[PDB]
Amino acid sequence: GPYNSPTFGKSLSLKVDGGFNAVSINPSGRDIVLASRQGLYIIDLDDPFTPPRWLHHITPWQVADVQWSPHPAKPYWIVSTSNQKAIIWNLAKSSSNAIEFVLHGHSRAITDINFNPQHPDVLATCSVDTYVHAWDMRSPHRPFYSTSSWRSAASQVKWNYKDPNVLASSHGNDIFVWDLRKGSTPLCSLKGHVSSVNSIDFNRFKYSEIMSSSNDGTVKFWDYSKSTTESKRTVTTNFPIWRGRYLPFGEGYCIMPMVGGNNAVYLINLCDDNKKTKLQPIYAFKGHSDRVIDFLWRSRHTCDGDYDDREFQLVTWSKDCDLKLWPISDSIYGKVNFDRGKRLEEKLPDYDYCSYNKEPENFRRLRENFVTTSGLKTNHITWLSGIRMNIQNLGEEVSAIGHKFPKVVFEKISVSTRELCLTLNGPWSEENPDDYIFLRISINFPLNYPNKGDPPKFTIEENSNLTMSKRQEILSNLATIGQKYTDSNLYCLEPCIRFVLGE
Amino acid sequence: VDTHHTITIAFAISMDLSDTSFKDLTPGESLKNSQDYFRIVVDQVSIIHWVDIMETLREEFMEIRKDLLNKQTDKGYSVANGRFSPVIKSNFLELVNFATTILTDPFKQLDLRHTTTHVMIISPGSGLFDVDYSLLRLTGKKLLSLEMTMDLICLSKAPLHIVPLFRYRDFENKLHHCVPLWLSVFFWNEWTPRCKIYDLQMMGITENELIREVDVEYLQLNKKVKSLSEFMNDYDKNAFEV
Amino acid sequence: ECLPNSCLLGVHLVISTHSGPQIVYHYPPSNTAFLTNEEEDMEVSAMLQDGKISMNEIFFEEENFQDINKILEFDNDFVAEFCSPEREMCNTRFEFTVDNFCFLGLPIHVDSQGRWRKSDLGKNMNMFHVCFVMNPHLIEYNKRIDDMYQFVVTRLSLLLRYVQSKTSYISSECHIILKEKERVLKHSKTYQSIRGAGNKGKYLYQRILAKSSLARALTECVDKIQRNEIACLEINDDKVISLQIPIQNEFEKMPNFKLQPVLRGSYLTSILNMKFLEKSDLLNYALLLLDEPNNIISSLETFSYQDDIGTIILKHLVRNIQPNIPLRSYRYLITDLLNSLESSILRSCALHLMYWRHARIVIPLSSKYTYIVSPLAPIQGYTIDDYVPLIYQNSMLFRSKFPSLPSLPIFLSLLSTDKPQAYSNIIPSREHKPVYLNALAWLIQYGYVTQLLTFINIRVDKHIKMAVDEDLEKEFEYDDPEMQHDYTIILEPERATAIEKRWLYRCIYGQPSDIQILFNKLLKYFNGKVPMELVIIKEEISRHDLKKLLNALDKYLIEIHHW
Amino acid sequence: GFVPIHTIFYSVFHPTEGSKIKYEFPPNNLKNHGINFNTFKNYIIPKPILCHKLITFKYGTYRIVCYPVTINSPIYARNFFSFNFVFVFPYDCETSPYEPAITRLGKMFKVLEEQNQLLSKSERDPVFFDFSIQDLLMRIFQDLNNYSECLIPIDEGNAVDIKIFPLLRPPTTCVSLEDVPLSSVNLKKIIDVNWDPTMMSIVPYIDGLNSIAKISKLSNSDPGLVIECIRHLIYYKCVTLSDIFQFSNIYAPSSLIRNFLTDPLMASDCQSYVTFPEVSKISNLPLNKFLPTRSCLFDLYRSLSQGQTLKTWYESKYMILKENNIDIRRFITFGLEKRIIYRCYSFPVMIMPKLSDEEEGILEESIRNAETFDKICVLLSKPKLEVESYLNELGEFKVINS
């Protein structure tokens, strides 16, 4: 289920090195995908201690956007841009070959990709070569719709939530609204922006409302049923805006800066009656020493659906290689006109909460054990250093000890299952005191570790080089150290390891 | 050099009207279904107006994609359709005959300030053109009867073959190669890549889908060999044949 | 690229004063097209006869000459303008590219107080810049510039800073260079009697090099770095500096011959200098001189000036050296000259010889070791880095060095036409043994012959597994096929599990105690990575003991043979 | 892959206050990072000798790439106009993919300033004489930092179209006639209309066992153009050279023979590769007249040795390959492709029908160049035994299996 998650009501920061430029989220709220030039990183948002699944695709050009498929019947699909082609990833497939099919459309780099909310098998791609192509995932070979602006490179493409064949694209200073049955001729051309428009977003509730954001600091709200020229509202900021989007709950919108603006995501209420105003946000998500490059939302709700009681968590990804989860308080839920608890006109969709970070797997061949697997993990011990649940964690303790002792080799680190298996060379030989014996110690932690009365369980693998009396003495001293350090409700894994080898 | 010319710049477009991929095109055969366009950008204009000439050229080149690839449907809207032909399958002899239209009559109006009629063809290819045989014969017979020098200039690197190269299919579907005498090829500019592989330079093929399918063979026999040593001897004897 | 290419085109000497920056001495005065594609006469004649002046005559030919006032299509004042940066861009890395020419240097500027170092031209000068011009390709630019700056420019500029701070040496060198330029251009009638601007510049440079010591240092540095050699430079007649760019001629894994070119004669061994230079026991190995001992003595006398204790010790070690005996046995050569201090001196001298292309490190050569012909043997190619062949040149050298031995083709065919056995099967008699070992050292030092080391991995069949299952139970079935074994290679037996360590210790079941003892001491090295030649040296065992364990354990031991 | 731009700024030479920065994205990025423009202002706007050249210099931890442009015309004040579109990168990267982009940006703006006086009129101040810069710099910065591409229209006919391409190593010149090419990709599906006709002819004959001389004779092609086409395919990292398979060859294990053990997919691919699809007839021939296990394949790969030819190795181990249905050519090819074995080349150094004059000339030239048996066999189009007999007729020779 989604309600036993440990990261939804809490704030959490993860350090994901590698230079990732794009991010997208599962609508179930379980997985988050990060795209780079080397491929995809899938992180479990309920088990952030596990290192993310790397799916390999090496490209020299920087990736633009990644997008999860919101189809409930296809929850294994990820569309990611690989320069001029979009790659659909099958997470049920193995990591060596996880690519299902590739959309070979535009000639220049794909700029943005979006899914149709009404029909989640329809995808629209925009690119630098001044083309917006609409694809069908049932027949992913040629686009069923092509349109162009013919002058300026596209920046985003977005679908209309209400009318399921209207999509808009932003090409420099101009926003063009396309009808899918009207060819390349636009329904309207919003031309009120001075500088280049970065982000575009439709309204989920109104048929004909679009918000825009540009480099001049202006956030413009449009209603193309009334007038193509001019705007219903114009909000001016002191910073350029990179991504501006409407809120998924209540009446409001969320914009974030491009190069300045204290690198904080801004949340602004939208509840009022041309109005050149300034930005008056409610909440600013302070943090993020370098600029934020995308923001997402994490939604969970009841499975059956009688009242609209859903909680939201903001997920932001920044240039300083930090992935942060932001809790949203009920003060924000009330300041935005959001009716928490309401009889549903239509029940909310239900998504499977299955993770995808784990590696999947399925003349004749004889059954054989050719080479030993044990003869065949510093990435894990460096990944666990970047996990911060905002020594206060088991994984932070494990990473600190792994950084403290480079000689100690970890064979199995599992913070989620609280099981540790580490190998070392210890001076515990009865024949010669100078001889070092290879030892395998498996450590099991309780769910109440490190509270008082809940010590870790130490099991040492049966070694021929280790005598039974010395093994029992080592185990008894390890139990003594664990009981003595859990009596003060401190952490006992560094005194134990420093006892086994050395003092 | 303080030359006083009259430039005349015209675009030259061949549009492919079929949905067949360009990889399926046979070398030597031209496109069966095509439409040919001609956008005259700058007319007979003196070269002291080179600022206006360049301005018009840049504006019309930026507008040619909207002009051609946005066809008008009778239902009241426009559909983004159409494709430019490749250089090899382009309408090169049609372009040259379009050029030689203006010299058919010796007794035309006299340009009393200018003397020579020189035609330059700017192409993004490398001197390789698939042409029709009868049109090639007619183009040669026409170019040998008038005072023009078609100076083809290629914006790609010089290839590994002799330029200009024309490939045509005869009446018996026989491939031929010929170098025309009347066309002179210039190139506008340590190892330099002189062979064009577009799908590997642009990385247009995803790494999981161009993995090698056909491998080394399975060492077929001879039906004359009864010993393994005889097989090794017959393989070593024929290891360098052909 | 593994082929050595020092991409120098020349050197500058750009100094600055309160009146403004200028240039002092630049070399060579050649054009871009060649580089890219009275008593003074008696003194210069004696210096050319004695070898004190080492210039390159091709830089002053008529087709390979540019004017002294022009450097690479730039004026002297122009170069002195853009190679004399501000105080914020001085005392740091000066990287500056003009298209394909990189102007790399470390300019030294005096501080605000007026001291060169933190501990006419003597007071006016506030900056000097020994600027090096390189033309590397764009794909190897970072590598070439980084190696040049790390190995030549920084060291030479720091030593020049020290000698200027303690002696004011560059000021005097600039003064005598400018005085000799004025005395040749405006006083000597020999200059006017010499035809051709190139020959005039050659005579002018001969006088400058005769009178100046910094000019000799810069000329030798450029000439011996462009020739890919060690540049020994004389500075202030009291200190010498040795400069080189290291050569990649050692390879553990075999490089691709027909995709990445590698110097012919490169050492395809698993024992490398760079595995030991980067660590700075080495005394378990033996040295192997890269030239004749007298040539090494002649080269090492130019590495110092006063014949100190280090040069005497190094000369004594080079004179009394043998490649068949380890360096640990050479403590007696320096105990008479004065863990342990002698072991440290031996280690430092071995690093000094093997870093400066004098004495390569090898496993000590024996007639009991199997020696194969390297794939990187210098057979093809006119020279080492070409890309009469090298086989015939080295055969002539082999015949000259050993006239009582079969030819180099005979030796290289006797070692590469049968299965590779020990080297003692080529030597006919014991009287021929030392000259054949000298031939073996010659073959290894030329890259013709490498060593075939033995690597052992441990393998377990179904019988050991069934015995271990029976022992575990202590505390199909209608047929018995003997060609359906269930085998298993324990890759690293040190980090073996509980069942796999039982497999290893059931492999030795009925063997005697010496086999039991030797298996336990050598089990951790049975991983396919440790050569058995190093195990014999380190563990103080003999070859008869090791050959017993290979014979007594035949179906369980994997034999792997590579370099 | 490609380094992000740190700061883009447009510096212009004012006729009154000299060289100055006009626009700079990000705003105040140079002063925040300690970069002082007055230290290197004489390189951004240098003398006209250094102008129209790609100037790159190091300033602290940053590498500053610029293409200074100076236009001499009497329309401007002081008879010249100078600008520079300057790019700042970190020092510890490779700015080589960005240098043609900056050079072409400077050249295109030089053309535009010489044509319609774009940058000089964009200042809106009549002191330089006798579209927004800041928006263009923002668009260039974020499009090259987010897409490695840009299409930014600046006029009705002008746009900034920049695509950053990776730099590739040049192919070697060591490719020869005796080398066989191995295509690592499916070359039939890469063929579009822009390919060279020679390469299109070569493609259906790169089967992993044809020599370059054999490919040249099969495709009716001159060997030099085949060498250049194989070089071009090497440049795109799709063809790797190998050796002609003969049973007179000598193969030995390399230092990477342990990679047959420490690899999760090498041995399984070996099992699926080296085996005949059916019970082949070679697995029924005598020596004279389930899939194979990975241990069998490893034991066969170790048993190769120097100085022992493949005929001797195969006649010593032929029941093993017959019972396990192993193709020896496929076995050797898989071993060479994974670089776990190598070939020891045979060198005929010196101390039957009448051979032709050109044939004896190329034989003598091959002998005097110490060429391998493979190259002589390719050049004479003869097997090894005929070459050996002709060499024994010509003189006495020894063979090195290096």
Residue numbers in the entry:
A (entry chain Q): 8 to 280, 286 to 374, 383 to 396, 400 to 413, 427 to 539
B (entry chain W): 318 to 506, 515 to 567
C (entry chain U): 3 to 39, 364 to 445, 525 to 685, 743 to 800, 814 to 862, 888 to 975, 1059 to 1146
D (entry chain S): 7 to 136, 195 to 353, 431 to 492, 565 to 615
Q: Paper's wording?
A:
The wings are tethered to the core via Sea3, which forms part of both modules.
We used a series of masks and focused refinements to improve the resolution, yielding maps at 2.8 Å and 2.7 Å resolution for the core and wings, respectively. Npr2 and Npr3 consist of an N-terminal lobe (N-lobe) and a C-terminal lobe (C-lobe), which interact with each other and are connected via a linker. The N-lobes contain the longin domains and are far from the SEAC core, whereas the C-lobe heterodimer faces the Sea4 β-propeller domain (II or III). As detailed below, the Npr2N-lobe also contains the catalytic arginine (Npr2Arg84). Sea1 is positioned at the edge of the wing and uses its SABA domain to interact with Npr2, whereas the C-terminal region (Sea1Cter), comprising the SHEN, the DEP (which is not resolved) and the CTD, is more flexible and does not interact with the rest of the wing. We could resolve an extension in the Sea1SABA that becomes partially ordered and inserts between the Sea3SIP β-propeller and the Npr2C-lobe, interacting with and wrapping the latter. The Npr3C-lobe plays an important role in organizing the wing relative to the core, as it is sandwiched between the Sea4 β-propeller and the Sea3 RWD, in addition to contacting the Npr2C-lobe.
